[PDB]
Write a protein that binds this ligand. Structure first.
Ligand SMILES: COc1cc(N(CC2CCCC2)C(=O)NCCCn2cncc2C)ccc1OCCN1CCOCC1
Ligand SMILES: [Zn+2]
Length: 321
């Protein structure tokens, strides 16, 4: 019956002084320097930067005081170039806990051929950095979960999202196609009474392509609608208290409108197995998407900080903290 708790979970909404605490307790300056800048490198799967990217992540996660259980999931899969290795990163609190909220990003960049290298600033680098910051910021509040609903937080940094040659069902989402199936096969909790690690997913909040100025995120899925509306309410109630920077209520990030087609992303292998997905990707896509102009100079430090704040409150509301 606990697989069905996700369908009924309710937030605990923070008060205005608490929102005043979380907006000061995070800072895009530290995020920029300590978490985001080292991943502004060439890091395709099986590359030198891929390892450096991965060890950046885990190191920062072990700087923290909350006892994150790190897991590297290395595996082989065929690509248009023969058999490659991919290693998803998975950071977990309360691995023994039955239900997990999952904030997800992919940390690989896409292999490209003038005098400029593709670092995918928005294509993963900022969203993966935003996941690092939130953990550093909420550390003192996550440390409360160490001492003991049965719900905690999980960070996933997928590998091999990108097409190697030409984007197709077969040449895409390597890291998440494997990790969904692996999760559909891993007995969770250690009791192993007919439940999977996929069943222990409450909600997959997949960040992607976030750093650009003026993003509008559509509401993709009915079954995550209410959490999209909590994102609206969180953005409203941060602005109304004057906690958002260069933010206007007429050009907001989270607008109600629906999306008709489907976008293929790391959520797709889990959506196909009945995981409630909250896909935080903007439509339209950033104009820099998949061009080497995708870089730090075309990022909006103030937009990212507003979204840092909005997301950090969502999971502090989701987790009843
Ligand atoms: C919404 O928008 C775009 C979506 C897509 N579909 C949809 C299908 C593609 C063909 C049929 C429908 C998509 O599955 N995509 C997967 C890429 C995923 N992926 C790569 N890295 C990070 C991620 C999440 C295709 C193109 C879209 O538009 C791009 C136009 N932009 C170009 C430059 O910037 C401004 C406009
Ligand atoms: Zn991409």
């Amino acid at each position: 019956a606990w697989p069905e708790e996700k369908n009924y979970h309710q937030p605990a909404i923070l008060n205005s002084s608490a929102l005043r605490q979380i907006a000061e307790g995070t800072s895009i300056s530290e995020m920029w320097q300590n978490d985001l800048q080292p991943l502004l490198i060439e890091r395709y799967p099986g590359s030198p930067g891929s390892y450096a990217a991965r060890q950046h992540i885990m190191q920062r996660i072990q700087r923290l005081q909350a006892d994150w259980v790190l897991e590297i999931d290395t595996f082989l899969s065929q690509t248009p170039y023969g058999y490659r290795s991919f290693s998803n990163i998975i950071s977990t609190l309360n691995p023994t806990a039955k239900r997990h909220l999952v904030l997800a990003c992919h940390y690989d960049s896409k292999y490209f051929s003038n005098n400029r290298v593709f670092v995918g600033a928005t294509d993963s680098a900022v969203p993966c950095a935003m996941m690092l910051e939130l953990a550093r910021a909420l550390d003192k509040k996550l440390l409360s979960l160490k001492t003991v609903p049965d719900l905690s937080l999980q960070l996933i940094f997928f590998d091999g999202e990108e097409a190697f040659l030409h984007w197709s069902p077969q040449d895409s989402l390597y890291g998440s196609r494997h990790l969904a199936a692996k999760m559909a096969s891993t007995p969770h909790p250690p009791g192993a009474r007919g439940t999977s690690q996929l069943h222990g997913m409450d909600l997959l909040v997949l960040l992607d392509l976030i750093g650009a100025p003026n993003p509008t995120f559509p509401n993709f899925f009915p079954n995550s609608a209410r959490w999209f509306e909590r994102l609206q309410a969180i953005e409203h109630e941060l602005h109304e208290l004057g906690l958002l920077k260069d933010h206007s209520l007429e050009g907001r990030y989270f607008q109600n409108y629906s999306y008709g087609g489907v976008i293929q992303d790391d959520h797709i292998p889990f959506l196909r197995r009945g995981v409630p997905v909250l896909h935080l990707i903007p439509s339209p896509f950033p104009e820099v998407w998949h061009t080497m102009d995708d870089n730090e100079e075309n990022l909006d430090e103030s937009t990212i900080d507003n979204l840092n704040k909005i997301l950090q409150v969502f999971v502090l509301e989701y987790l009843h903290l």
